[PDB]
């Protein structure tokens, strides 16, 4: 006993508590990071739409103005 | 009458430890460092999410502006 049992118990309890904290941290990490991922996926489609639209608009308007 | 009898004494084997104080301390230190790293990652991830949310509005505004300008120019052209 003496330092033996007290060290065993105290270190085990503290390690368990810390590990539970890490588990919760990782869960929250995963949730928020998934939200960020879907947010970027949302960005992508509108980026593509904008580039296609601007390219077509500039080409068509330049041709139309030059021909006139 | 050489009939003898005895009594017994007991000893306790050492409790389970004396290997839980060298790897243990290193384990605790590593756990603390991992906790600090996780906190820092939390903060950085929240900041990145805020920045992405900020970007979204400008993205939508530019899309709307370009679409409206193109439609107006087409309408005036014809």
Residue numbers in the entry:
A (entry chain H): 191 to 258
B (entry chain G): 6 to 83
Quote the study on this structure.
The membrane-anchored SNARE (soluble N-ethylmaleimide-sensitive factor acceptor protein receptor) proteins provide the energy to drive membrane fusion in various cellular contexts, such as intracellular trafficking and exocytosis. Supercomplexes of NSF, α-SNAP, and either a syntaxin tetramer or one of two binary complexes of syntaxin—SNAP-25 reveal atomic details of SNARE processing and show how sequential ATP hydrolysis drives disassembly. NSF comprises three structured domains connected by flexible linkers—the adapter N-domain followed by the D1 and D2 AAA+ domains. Six NSF protomers come together to form the active form of the enzyme, a homo-hexamer.
